[PDB]
Amino acid sequence: SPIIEANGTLDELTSFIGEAKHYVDEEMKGILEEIQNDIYKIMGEIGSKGKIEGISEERIKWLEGLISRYEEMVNLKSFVLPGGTLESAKLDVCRTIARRAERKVATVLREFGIGKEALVYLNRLSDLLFLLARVIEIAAAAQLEKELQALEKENAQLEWELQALEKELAQ
Amino acid sequence: SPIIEANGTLDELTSFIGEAKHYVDEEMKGILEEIQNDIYKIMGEIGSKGKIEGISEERIKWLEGLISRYEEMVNLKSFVLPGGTLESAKLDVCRTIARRAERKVATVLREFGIGKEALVYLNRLSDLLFLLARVIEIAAAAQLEKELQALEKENAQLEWELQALEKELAQ
Amino acid sequence: SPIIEANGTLDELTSFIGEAKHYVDEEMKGILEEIQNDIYKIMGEIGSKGKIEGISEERIKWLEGLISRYEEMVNLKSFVLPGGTLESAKLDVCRTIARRAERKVATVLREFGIGKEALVYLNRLSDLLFLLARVIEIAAAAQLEKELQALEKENAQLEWELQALEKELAQ
Amino acid sequence: SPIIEANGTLDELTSFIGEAKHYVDEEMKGILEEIQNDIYKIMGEIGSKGKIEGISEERIKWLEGLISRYEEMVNLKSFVLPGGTLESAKLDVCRTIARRAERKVATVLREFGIGKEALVYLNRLSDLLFLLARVIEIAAAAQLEKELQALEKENAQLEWELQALEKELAQ
Amino acid sequence: SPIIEANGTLDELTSFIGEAKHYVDEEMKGILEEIQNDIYKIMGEIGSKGKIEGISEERIKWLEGLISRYEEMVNLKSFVLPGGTLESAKLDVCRTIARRAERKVATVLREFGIGKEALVYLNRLSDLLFLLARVIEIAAAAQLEKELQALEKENAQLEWELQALEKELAQ
Amino acid sequence: SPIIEANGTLDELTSFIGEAKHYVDEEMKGILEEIQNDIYKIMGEIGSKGKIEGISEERIKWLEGLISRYEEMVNLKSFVLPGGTLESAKLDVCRTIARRAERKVATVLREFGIGKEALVYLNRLSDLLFLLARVIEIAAAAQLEKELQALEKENAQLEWELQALEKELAQ
Amino acid sequence: QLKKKLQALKKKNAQLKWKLQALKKKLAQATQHLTIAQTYLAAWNEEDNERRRHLVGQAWAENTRYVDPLMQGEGQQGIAAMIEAARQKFPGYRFVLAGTPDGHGNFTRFSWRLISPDGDDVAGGTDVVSLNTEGRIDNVVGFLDG
Amino acid sequence: QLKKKLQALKKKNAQLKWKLQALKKKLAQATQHLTIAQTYLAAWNEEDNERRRHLVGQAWAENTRYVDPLMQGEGQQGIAAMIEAARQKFPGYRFVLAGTPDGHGNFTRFSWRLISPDGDDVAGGTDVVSLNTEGRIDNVVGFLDG
Amino acid sequence: QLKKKLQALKKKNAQLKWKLQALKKKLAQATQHLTIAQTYLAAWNEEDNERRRHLVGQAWAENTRYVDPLMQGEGQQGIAAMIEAARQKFPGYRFVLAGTPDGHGNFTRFSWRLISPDGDDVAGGTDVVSLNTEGRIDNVVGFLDG
Amino acid sequence: QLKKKLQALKKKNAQLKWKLQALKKKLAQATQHLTIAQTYLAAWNEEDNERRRHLVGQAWAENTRYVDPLMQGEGQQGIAAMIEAARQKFPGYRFVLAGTPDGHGNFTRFSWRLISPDGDDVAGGTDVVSLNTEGRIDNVVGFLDG
Amino acid sequence: QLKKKLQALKKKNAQLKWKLQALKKKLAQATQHLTIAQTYLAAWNEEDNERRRHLVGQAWAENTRYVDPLMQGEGQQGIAAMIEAARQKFPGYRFVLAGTPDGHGNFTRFSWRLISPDGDDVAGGTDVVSLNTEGRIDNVVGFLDG
Amino acid sequence: QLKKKLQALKKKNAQLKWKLQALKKKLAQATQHLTIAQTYLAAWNEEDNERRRHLVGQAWAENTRYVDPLMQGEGQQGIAAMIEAARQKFPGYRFVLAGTPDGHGNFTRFSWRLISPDGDDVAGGTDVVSLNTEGRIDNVVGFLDG
Lengths: 171, 171, 171, 171, 171, 171, 146, 146, 146, 146, 146, 146
Description:
- The complex is a heterododecamer, with six copies of chain A and six copies of chain G.
- By secondary structure, chain A is mainly α.
- Chain A contains five helices and no strands.
- The longest helix of chain A has 54 residues, at 116-169.
- Chain G has helices at 2-45, 49-59, 75-89; strands spanning 60-67, 72-74, 94-104, 107-115, 121-131, 137-145.
- Chain G has a six-stranded mixed β-sheet with strand order 2-1-6-5-4-3.
- Chain G is elongated and about 75 Å long.
- Chains A, B, C, D, E, F: Keywords: ATP-binding, Metal-binding, Nucleotide-binding, Transferase.
- Chains A, B, C, D, E, F: Residues 1-135 form the Cobalamin adenosyltransferase-like domain.
């Protein structure tokens, strides 16, 4: 049942987005809710065998625009292990669920000729979710890199300030 | 391997209930543990190809009774997006996992003639999990709607109390 | 697509380990990160149809050593319900995801003759994840059993200390 | 030696006035010093056997004027005993010394025809000295009679004032 | 003029008693006033040439009784110099005035046969006045002899009390 | 009775010295007591009709020495009135009593040939008593003249000191 | 006797006058104890509770203390409350002075009788009151009599 | 916005409530200055001199001090005398509050107008009053205004 | 119930512990009243008068005051004299504590019985004792009981 | 007259001497008011602010209070600040004594004129100063004059 | 000489008596310094530590202060501890008075020798003690001697 | 180690910062003892006696007390006199601080050397100084050293 399996997995995908969105900021949550809205539309087209209009091409270009934006912030993308943080772990899970759904939807297009835009949309969707996890790793870690240097500098300063006062007493 | 796939997914389903039950109240947790118990029994019947007695019809009527109870509290059920809250998101995920398992179990009944009650049980189970998420959305939100009006009324009262005292000083 | 399905599920498996590792201690997190590393290697062999060397047998013996260690702490293992705690629930989910991946990988070995060690590795992996959940249940609960007796003994002592002082006043 | 005896006694007389004048008031002292002056003049006439002018008749009238003045203040003059007070005692002594001198001077006039005014002067002089003693007794005593009634009246008043307050307490 | 001279001196005598009586105690003053009264009576008899009754013999015995009383207190009476004190000096003067009057009165008795008792009275009177001066010397001095020994004994005691405390400190 | 009259008056004289000596200083009192002693000796010679040795010529020279000493302090001696002070009044009285006694003693020498030194002694004695009164007037008054100038100078100084401070305030 | 009679009365006058000195001193005493008794009882007999708060605030010191056999209090507030409670429990009852108050130093002793609203004599008490260095009541001690 | 809207009002409520805290504090202030002005002026406007002695004895402290440009006094007695003299010299005259008294700490500032018995405005003054640690008036300073 | 059982006992423990806090506080109370009673009665029951002067000098404050229905005194000297007179008039007599002393703040109430030298119970009393800011006895008030 | 003349001057001397007693007393008075005026004005006329802090710390008491019609302060710090602000606002200006200070008890009254840096007379004031029991300035009250 | 001899001895008596007045005053002095020395040394020589706490509590004031060249303390507790430590370190040792204590006002000076348990003279010191307004020891200062 | 490294430094920072808290506290200490030593010695080394009276009047309290082994005094006057006598007897001599003053609470200990006018070291001493509740010197105790 390519149709039933495909639509079942798409339901799982949008459900996983509903969970991850409670672990991200307002900006990421807004994006995820729009994508969840888009998944709802995709399911309509596939579920109706073409009887119901699917998603617009603008939804695909929307993802590509966001992918480009976050792509610019990640330099190293080839060797990262999934789930650097609890928040990024949620996004990595969704990416893999999207991947079986992408495959299942490919089958629907193959046998029904519908879902052309939905298929491309899901392909780009998994790419973006990956970058978001990495970005979260950058946002959680780079800001933590700031706090790291801060206490490292404060410590050093307190060492010098103490060494001065001790020998400055017994003068 | 319809049998291996079906039983594997049922294991996944009961495992997902084990996670969501730590995010709900005592009442919801009790229900989920009984259902988890029921899933354990269902797996026995399917796994033994009929050699082991399955679940009783009373377990199905039990779900139907709970479905009716919560069904009475939800008016609008046609257009809601999954995962309104972190707690409701956990239940929405389980519903979709139940749906592939329902399909996989349907195949077992089709080819082995066992799982008649298990099949109907899983069908009703997904329906109930949906309502629980919505109820949680009502319980988390309607009680939050109370706190919303409370601070809105307190504010207004404090505005009036201040406007009185200022012009009541310079008299 | 046994290859695409098998590798897709393995991606899901390592992604689920990435999430659970933020809910366990340093020791459990270290083990999970090594396993996640191992899953990465397994995917390489399967994905290359044998062109890329797979995992070593030492990775399998490593799991067996850890299984023996934790196996020694669990007496009763036949009748436990999944997800005793939120932390243990995360591990139980991974075990079931590993089980479909194990099956999918078995198919790859069957038709491609690669993944012999990967197949055995995944079989032992699910066994260990089960014990870790139970151990977490022991670590979270047995230490909680200590706190249970502590307040039970303190209470009793405070009862006796009070009964003495009251009748010791009105003497 | 009527002359030598007469003049010797007159010297005694004026000497006794010199003593009494330190025990009387300014008014009495002034009078006594004028009389002492007069006695000095009298001795000149007698001592020179008439060669030196004696006292004038105005000195005799002067005494008579003073005698009349004090005579008016003394009612009872027949039965008084000499020396009522220390001061009056001094004057009573002088009166008797004057009396032998008066007699001695009478002899000089009898045999020499000088001292006619001196003889009359001495006669009146003794009369005045008597009244002065009595006056001093009146001045010392009548003013003391005032102080007598004063403490007698104060006492009586204090008796009444006390008898009132005592029974006015225990009411 | 034995009569005029005698009576003149008697006037002087009673006048001198009037002065001395302000320098003696109540007892001595009472006696002196009675004697002054007696001198007044004596002058009556002498002045009337017998026409007026004179003093009674009881007045003479009265003096003799007082003379005996004071005579008993004076041991040494042969070598005392007149006027030991101001008070005793007054009495010694009266004694000598009494002595010429005694002589003058003796002449009156010799030529007129009156004054037999008066003559004896005056003889005893001078004797008593002498003893009174000596008694006053005893009363003023013996009581002063008491005060002499008192300060002499106090001094000595204070010397001993001091010599003790000084060497009793530096122990 | 020249003898009886003479000795009677001498008794009066020494009695008057006994009174005045309580009103003078130690120096004057000592002199008066020696003179009183001398009068006692004089009475012995006169009273015994020559049978008892009289006073020595040294007693006369003693008086002359004292007369010269006090004579040097009195410039004006011709016009002074008797009794400037109570103390000097006592001495002036004694001088006049001495004068009749001097006359009476002269008679004894005239008819008995005794008292040659006593007669001269009494003559000088009256002269000295006069100077003592004047000296007492100088001692009582000149020292009082000192106190007069003292308060007169203090007053004047206090006037100037006040006139300065008043106008020195309102500057 | 002339001198003796004048002197004799001056001595007598000196005695009589000092005894008037001591005797007038005794008068201010007994009145002082009566004033304190009246002020204390006036507060207990006052029907209007407001005036009583005003009176105690003025007459009583801030640091004042009371104690009797059933109750105790210190300060104007505490004493005002006690007084308020006592009058509220016995409306119409009155405290009437008995005998003559007396005392010494800053201590006054007096007795009183409790008179019922209908005029029956049902009991009595005795109190000791102390004044502070500022003329204000700092201590009252009451007792019961049979 | 759901979470943001609830949180947004809690922040707002916190501000509004503390400003009510500060604002009510301001009310007790201006009333405190009015009460002191009325009590001070009530003593000056009181026609009966006896009540004024009673009032000052109760309201004023024993150690209290007053000073103005023509006169000065300290203590209830001295101030009572000054008040007695002032009213005796100006019988029927009254002191009426002007403007709103204000102040800070134990200091109060206010102005007043002197009203003649027939109601003419002839002048005014300003006073500063200080309270002692026992709630009683310990210091008053007056001034003249043109 | 697992979580509920742990939490359920922590709540229970919190109550039981604070009641031990309050309850131990009650123990120091009743003992404090007994110590004061014993010290007070020990002074009255002490046969040797010298030790009693030493005790009062140490235990009692210099500014201390006593008053009962027949007598009164203040200060160590005055109280020492009263104590000396009382024991001299009743040689061999003793004061024995009756019932359990109690109280609040610096006030202690207790009763006692007067025991005759031969052991007969002839009467009893009640006293209230106050401590000064230096731990020394500054006030004692006694009463009579029937 | 001899005795009368000596006695007559002793009486006169007694009067004159006591009037010197009273009169010298008057001298210490007016000087005391001048010293306080100079010390007070010296602080206001002192150009160097440091010396003024030192002077007030030494001469003024720690518990001291000032009040005038525009401003008020209490304590050395507060007064030092006021003085610092006044001199900083009017650099070069000076306060010169006017008339003779006078007073009574611990009160001194004096007037002063405010002289402009160029020497023009532009106004004047009057102040009342009080000393504390330790010889240090505890109170100053200033006034304005027309 | 009669009058001169009586008067001559009265003058002499007046001198001798006032010198007895001054001289007896000197006796109370030297004894006062000895009593303080004995009480101070008695505390240092007391073998039983309990009696010493009792003694210091009674004899010493609550606000008392001690300082010497090696150590210092203030209050009964602190001094009691010092005394306890000193005796514990030198068991059996004794402090014996040396020379005659003397002094003036509330100051006493005396010297003492430290005697070893076997009776050897090994050293000595000097102390100055001050009494508070309540007759209790408020200050002790010790010194070392060679 | 990521989380462990951040947390590891926060713990370390907390320790280092509190040790800076304690360590700076130590700096104000040793300086406080130096200031007191300089002020005390400055008074002893001051050549002009007038400035010294002014300094002691300002810096020293009115109730202050000094005692050493040969002499003693209390109050600014008494101490000023002692200081005047000491400098008059040793003109040109100076007191120089030795070692670092130290102390605790209101106590300071320091040593000094007495330097002769020609610069020879002839001896030294040690003093303990106490401050009163008003920041003014109330007690100084000196000692001799060999």
